[PDB]
Amino acid sequence: MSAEVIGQVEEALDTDEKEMLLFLCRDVAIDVVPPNVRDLLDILRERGKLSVGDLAELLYRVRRFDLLKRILKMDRKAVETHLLRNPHLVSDYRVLMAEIGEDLDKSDVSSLIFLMKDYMKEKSFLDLVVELEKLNLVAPDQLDLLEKCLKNIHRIDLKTKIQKYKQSVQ
Amino acid sequence: MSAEVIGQVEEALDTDEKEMLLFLCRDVAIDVVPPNVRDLLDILRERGKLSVGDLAELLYRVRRFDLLKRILKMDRKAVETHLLRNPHLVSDYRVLMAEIGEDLDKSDVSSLIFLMKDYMGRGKISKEKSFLDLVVELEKLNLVAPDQLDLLEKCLKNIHRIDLKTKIQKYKQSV
Amino acid sequence: SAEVIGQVEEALDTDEKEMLLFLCRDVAIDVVPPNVRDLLDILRERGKLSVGDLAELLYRVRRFDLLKRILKMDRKAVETHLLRNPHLVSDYRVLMAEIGEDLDKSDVSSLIFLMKDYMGSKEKSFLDLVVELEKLNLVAPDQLDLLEKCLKNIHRIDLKTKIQKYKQSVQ
Amino acid sequence: MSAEVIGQVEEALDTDEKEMLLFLCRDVAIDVVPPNVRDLLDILRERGKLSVGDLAELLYRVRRFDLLKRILKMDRKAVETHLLRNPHLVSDYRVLMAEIGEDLDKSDVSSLIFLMKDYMGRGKISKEKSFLDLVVELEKLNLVAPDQLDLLEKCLKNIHRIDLKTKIQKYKQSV
Amino acid sequence: MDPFLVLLGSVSSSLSSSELTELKFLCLGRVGKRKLERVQSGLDLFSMLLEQNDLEPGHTELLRELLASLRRHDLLRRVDDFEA
Amino acid sequence: MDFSRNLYDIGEQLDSEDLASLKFLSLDYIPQRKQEPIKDALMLFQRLQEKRMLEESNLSFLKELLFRINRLDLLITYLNTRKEEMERELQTPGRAQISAYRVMLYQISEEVSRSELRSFKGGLQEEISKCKLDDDMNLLDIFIEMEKRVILGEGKLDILKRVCAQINKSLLKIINDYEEFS
Amino acid sequence: MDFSRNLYDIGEQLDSEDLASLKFLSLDYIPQRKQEPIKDALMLFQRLQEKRMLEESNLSFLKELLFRINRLDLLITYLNTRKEEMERELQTPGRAQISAYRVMLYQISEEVSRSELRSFKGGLQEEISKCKLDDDMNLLDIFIEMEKRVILGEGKLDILKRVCAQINKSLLKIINDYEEFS
Amino acid sequence: MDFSRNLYDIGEQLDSEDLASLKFLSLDYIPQRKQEPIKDALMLFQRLQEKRMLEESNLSFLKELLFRINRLDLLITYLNTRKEEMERELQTPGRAQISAYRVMLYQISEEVSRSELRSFKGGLQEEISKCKLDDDMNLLDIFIEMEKRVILGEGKLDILKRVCAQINKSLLKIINDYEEFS
Amino acid sequence: MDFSRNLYDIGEQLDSEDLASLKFLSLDYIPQRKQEPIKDALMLFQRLQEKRMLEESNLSFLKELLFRINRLDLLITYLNTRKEEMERELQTPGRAQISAYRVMLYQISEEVSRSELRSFKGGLQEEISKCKLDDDMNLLDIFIEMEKRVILGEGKLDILKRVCAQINKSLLKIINDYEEFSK
Amino acid sequence: DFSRNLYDIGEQLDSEDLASLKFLSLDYIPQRKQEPIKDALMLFQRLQEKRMLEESNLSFLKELLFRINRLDLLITYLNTRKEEMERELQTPGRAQISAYRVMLYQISEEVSRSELRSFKGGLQEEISKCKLDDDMNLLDIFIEMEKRVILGEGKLDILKRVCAQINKSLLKIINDYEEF
Ligand SMILES: [Se]
């Protein structure tokens, strides 16, 4: 692990992938609020939470296996075995949030925002999740409102994903 | 209450929440004009106006309930009960101003600035200014006040924002 | 008193402080006050900081909240005082400040690019440019033709008419 | 040359050009760290190392040909012939550093600083560092030198500035 | 891999908008709906599959499958020409 | 005196895209560090005056810049120069200050649409990092990024020809005309 | 009757197409650099206010602009001016602030459909680069580009007539009617 | 009452044609600049919510809009209001928020086919430019343009009668029925 | 089993008329705003997939749709379901996902010719505006407009019978059979 | 100039020839892909996308033009006589159109208008009236029957039943196809 690796990863990511990476690491950097992804990775490395396996997990969550093979020289088997044997840096709740966000187009996100204006710009679903977290409306143990709102926009598949996560927590 | 709490609050807030928090404490920090939020909190603590309940109210006004639960270990009901039992650090006027500002996009704020430029005297500054900055400018010109909201009411009516006019009217009725 | 001067110095903003220094450039003779606190101290020591003088200074920077909180005066009272008593700050400085407030950074940059020929720095305020021109004898209460033409060339005819209105106000 | 010339040069330069001029004369420094450029030029004149040709070379390195013709009454051809026929006041290493610095935007400079912090450290807390400031920091840490450019080569390669790597290679080949 | 990139570019340029929507529907499951909404060309989807390592010059199974589903063997011949 | 006003009027009649074109065509004389803060024409003019390539007695480089960006209206109205006069002056081999390589690159950028630019960016995936392939990058910035990696140059036109063959056929004709001019 | 409120109401009743028409009709008074950031009507008004062409005592240019874009409803509702009045005001010589050459051009843009615009752009292939002929450009932008390349003008209408004859004959009638007013 | 969810379902049961009808029916309250970006029903609701014309306690304007576009199914399913009620509610004077002049116009748009719309456009050639008479324009846009050119209005129905009489008699009957309410 | 490719082939064997029929039969689950941009079968499937009514383990709604549009070839070729099965599956109560009211309407559209459609439009002159009675309107769109005007429904079949009696008698037979089934 | 030759061949074909070619190409172009084909050229392009039409493979185009009895185009634009095509199609392998399809088309060649009325009247119990409208030719009836799985390569019972009630040559064609 070095600065060259962080630079390569930062230069290989796009704006949306950077925004997603910032959201996934919200649970590990709760004190400081890193502005850019480079600062986030630097903070994680300084705090000893950015080993080769941690960066491998981060690249695996954004589904950038080309970077896993080119930069970190790792395949899916290595990252999956590391995640099986070592504790995860990003919780399953954040991965579920990101997955739900990836299965939503801008129209669905707009309709979802319109439903939740009673309880609470082209803002992404992850920004809405951050706003709900700041308002204590969504949490790994508090998904009922998001489930109902996804049901009301006729997105029963995402409701089923949330229910599968809830059953996986048991 | 300690320095760690102030540091956590200052580092956990974003730019918009910081700018809002500075505006909400304008009525209690008159003797100093705090540049950053940390200086504001230090001044409030030194002058004895930053107890645990005061910081809880400040976090509740910026709608940062996650910080209310993580830092101060409080829910919304507890902070509301504290506001019921104790006099408020932030007046309802500042909260109303912030509420009106949150329901205004850049286009609405620009159109509102264009309607008021006759009473301002402000020149050609092109820096996109927030509604709270406009309220600060109006206060500097003695054009808006908790007992002087007619100009803001009329200008919000003229930009077709009748809901904010109703917020102003309900605030006036609560007095 | 000193508490009032301290309150005024702490209550002013950077732009308001710079404007106050520029407006008091003509009354602080032989001295160049760096900060507003030093300027107010000099004015008080020299006997040029009465209640009316501070009221006029606060009125010129359009800081009526300090006029109401500190000096307990409305805009009408200060305007009547300015009507009845001689001014501490001449109308030329007020016109310069008004023109500067009606100029964006791009307009000031283009104006500096036009005037750089008559004065052989970046991010300069309009008041700094006016001070530079005054030190070079390029602008004066009786010498506004060059500034007028330069404002005409940046397609700012409203400021040219402000200058013409000042010229008509002189007689 | 004379004092009026030094005064005109000091008054005509901007902050970035002043910083660059201070960097180019770092090798000639007579056991002193001059803060101001006027002081540096005065020291060079007193030490007999600021003739008309030396100041012409200094103005040529900062690409201020208008000052070269207005103050010293020279064109590019005259100063280029003077540099061809006479030994230089500023070594080719400083000129290479200045050229590399001019071919780097803020993003490339930030990425270069981010790469150097492993070999160097955070250094000055200021986030507005020029390439020349970084070169000075590396020189103080014995990380870059006219005979030690491999680290700079690698760091420029990692920020995809192969043209600057070729500049460094051409300098290495010319010695 | 520039020959592979020119393969992908030629295949993307030889597709219509309807075929692009068909490919978008076919790739749903490997690529999210949000990412598919931003796809404006076959090359975009091919590059998104390149990043996820579901597609590479060594393993062209996904490309051949997607292109055979669209009953377009004219571009399958281009793929086979690249394979040799 | 009037010279500065004329420069200001010329700059006021220039847009941001024309400004980017002017910055690209003057890359061989103004480096990137000094070119980054150039957000108005007057600043470019100031830099040129600092390099004596623009004076009241030297309008050659300004006329060449305004002619190559096809802003003949400003050339005829503010600089008193016609199109034919400029053609004749630029047919002489010595008088051309902007390299034919720059002009050729700029004309390629003039003959590339938005979808063609997207295909260009998709064709340069293995050679340029993704951060520099954002949708806000025009073709000239991509040319600059290629020049940084010594992939584009007066002697290295291979990848340029490859991507142009991947997008359109007239671009190869422009490249071959420049190459045959040598 | 607040002047600022009246201007705001007038601007609220104008869409992006009317805004582009007003920006084109004010090209002779607002340069390209100052026209680029104009994304709403109020901004435009401010520019006019900086040249004293719009104040509570000078509504002539605003009324002329609203009349040339055929927005008589705003003229009668917010400016208290009927259709006939303006006509007489614009029939007196000298008092017309928008040039007859400009108005003519805009009127041509009023008589061109989408397919006719595509035919125009396809007819200007050899004279204008592809980047300035993209599908996201209306006829006024084509007029601006033609003026930049000194192929269109008050004295240079040859290519205009040539391309208009390839599409419609009434456009040639408008061109000749403008020409006779000289 | 999930007021936002109810509004969302009502909007989900509305297509683009009903949206254009609602936007036309709300012209007297939402200006053109604010109507231009309205591309879905929800947005429209927000505008109404900004004027207090749509709230959990004030559904009168929403019910009137849904009744005038003949979407009684949404009125009965999501707003719990049958056809008769609305009628009585709209027969009481003052309570009608949409002007009778507007409604009439929309009803004319209900009784014009495609060939009749083409004949309408051909009959309005001397008063409206070709850009607004293209085949992709609907009758409501023609009404809007006529209102802009002060040829159609609450007091000026002459040209409307002229063009309607040339095609069908029921349109003139609707016009006369609207006129009798005076 | 490439479920997506199989759905793609099924969509490739469907034209625009079958697509309009499927969109009408899916009106009870997909609103008008979501149905408007549906110009191909695939997109339609996507909407169903968003409501958990179409997946690799749930083919009931797809089979019902293909059976109601009389596309038994697709049922036998791509879904491995014969004609008899889909009958028994739909004869068991509860198991029918498409309402009997909807299917009936579609079946009426199966027994109306072009001149009969013109007569239908002429019979609905006083109840529907001319814009919705143009010649480019099929019978299903007329049914949709009637439902919008609360003239057609599960409890309001009066105008339907009135207009059908003026054209043909078998349509009244279908209507009466539907009424006799919903006792 | 292969592209110009294809364009000229397509320009010499009317809408009826286009419908015949689209029916004869049903085994290679699905219904959704056939719907927007409103000219002959657009059909050829589809074949080019399936590698059944190129400058080196004209077999399928020649077979289509021969089965539609357009020998003039074969002689003028493809330089191929009737005997060449006879020999080419008599070999049991190179024939690309299935014998089941051709047979059907040939039945459509031997049915008059009154016979079409009799066919439509004979398919009342299996086909709805909407698909039996007066604008329906025999090929569309074949397509509808295939959709309703009553006609096929293994299900010819209803076809023989309806054909025997009208003419004997139709049953003769069916039996000739079956014996092959
Ligand atoms: Se004072």
Residue numbers in the entry:
A (entry chain K): 1 to 120, 127 to 176
B (entry chain I), D (entry chain H): 1 to 175
C (entry chain G): 2 to 121, 126 to 176
E (entry chain L): 1 to 84
F (entry chain A), G (entry chain B), H (entry chain C): 1 to 182
I (entry chain D): 1 to 183
J (entry chain E): 2 to 181
From the paper:
In this work, we present the crystal and cryo-EM structures of ternary FADD-Casp-8-cFLIP DED complexes, unveiling FADD-FADD, FADD-Casp-8, FADD-cFLIP, Casp-8-cFLIP, and cFLIP-cFLIP DED assemblies in a complex. The atomic coordinates depict how FADDDED and Casp-8tDED could assemble a helical 1:5 and 3:3 intermediate complexes, and how these FADD-Casp-8 intermediate complexes are targeted and capped by four cFLIPtDED molecules.
Subsequently, we obtained the protein crystals and determined the crystal structure at 3.1 Å resolution using the MR-SAD method, in which FADD DD is not visible. Notably, the crystal structure reveals a 1:5:4 stoichiometry for the FAFuL_H9G-C8FGLG-CFH7G complex. In the 1:5:4 FAFuL_H9G-C8FGLG-CFH7G complex structure, three Casp-8tDED molecules C8c, C8d, and C8a provide, respectively, a type Ia, a type IIa, and a type IIIa surfaces, while FADDDED molecule FAl provides a type IIa and a type IIIa surfaces to complete the CBS to recruit cFLIPtDED_H7G molecule CFk.
